[PDB]
Amino acid sequence: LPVFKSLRHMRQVLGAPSFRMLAWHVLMGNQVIWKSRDVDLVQSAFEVLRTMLPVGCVRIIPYSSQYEEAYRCNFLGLSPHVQIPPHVLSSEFAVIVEVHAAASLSKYEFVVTSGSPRVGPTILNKIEAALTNQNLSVDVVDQALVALKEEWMNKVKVLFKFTKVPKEDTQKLLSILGASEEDNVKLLKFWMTGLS
């Protein structure tokens, strides 16, 4: 009963700024750390978050008793008293979500942190915007995410096929495809790991 049910639910619970920072890290392939007493809640978090990535981009250690580095996983679950190394705590390339009992999910308080820095990537804005509109049916949200994800994976394919070979050509192509901006370029690079 105390689990995340959707992206939208997760957004309601964590809050808008926190969700956006969390989602940006998921999308870019940065390490996502969840520290909780509750194994199932954490599993539900990952089940929800993974829907934002191509299935090939997911490497999960669901509930570890020690910190594991990024090469080990991009999704990491943790026991409550596990200690996170300083480089992680201050990293701009990881996000930590810590769950505690508070004084759906009312009994928990969530704190989301990351090393301090943005505008994109585009799929994030589009995803956040869909979650935002409370007038959206669940099926619409779900089907839109699938589509959005597919559109972005296609761009990855197009980009891979294209750079099988000037160099300024790539930016030009990307520009037509609406994917020239710095974050979009970073996302495509990461998403390419989800392809052979």
Author numbering: 343 to 445, 459 to 472, 477 to 524, 528 to 558
Give verbatim lines from the article.
Birt–Hogg–Dubé syndrome (BHD) is an inherited genetic disorder that predisposes individuals to renal cell carcinoma (RCC), benign skin tumours and lung cysts that lead to recurrent spontaneous pneumothorax. In BHD patients, the most common germline mutation that can lead to RCCs occurs in the mutation hotspot, exon 11, of the FLCN gene, and produces a truncated folliculin protein that lacks the C-terminal half. In this study, we use structural and biochemical analyses to show that folliculin is probably a distant relative of the differentially expressed in normal cells and neoplasia (DENN) family of guanine nucleotide exchange factors (GEFs) and demonstrate that it possesses in vitro nucleotide exchange activity towards Rab35 GTPase. Through structure–function analyses, we report that folliculin, which is commonly mutated in patients suffering from these malignancies, has an unusual architecture that classes it into an ancient family of proteins called the DENNs.
In order to understand the essentiality of the C-terminal region (amino acids 341–566) and reveal the function of full-length folliculin, we have determined at 2 Å resolution the three-dimensional structure of the C-terminal domain of folliculin, henceforth called folliculin-CT. We have calculated phases by the multi-wavelength anomalous dispersion (MAD) method using anomalous scatterers from selenomethionine (see §4). The folliculin-CT crystallized in C2221 space group with two molecules in the asymmetric unit related by twofold non-crystallographic symmetry. The fold of folliculin-CT is dominated by an αβ architecture with a core β-sheet and helices packed on the one side, followed by an all-helical region. Indeed, the strand topology differs, and the signature Walker A and B motifs conserved for function across NTPase families are absent in the folliculin-CT domain. Interestingly, folliculin-CT shares remarkable structural similarity with the DENN domain of the DENN1B-S protein; both proteins have the same order and orientation of strands. Although the sequence identity is only 11 per cent, a structural alignment using the program Baton (based on Comparer) shows a r.m.s.d. of 2.8 Å over its 170 core-aligned residues, corroborating the strong similarity and probable homology. Indeed, biochemical analysis of a representative set of Rabs reveals that folliculin-CT, in vitro, has GEF activity towards Rab35, and this is confirmed using a subset of Rabs with the full-length folliculin, which shows similar activity to the folliculin-CT. The truncated folliculin polypeptide chain found in BHD syndrome is missing the c-DENN and d-DENN modules, and retains only the u-DENN region—which is the only part of the DENN homology region that is kept in the more compact yeast folliculin orthologue, LST7.
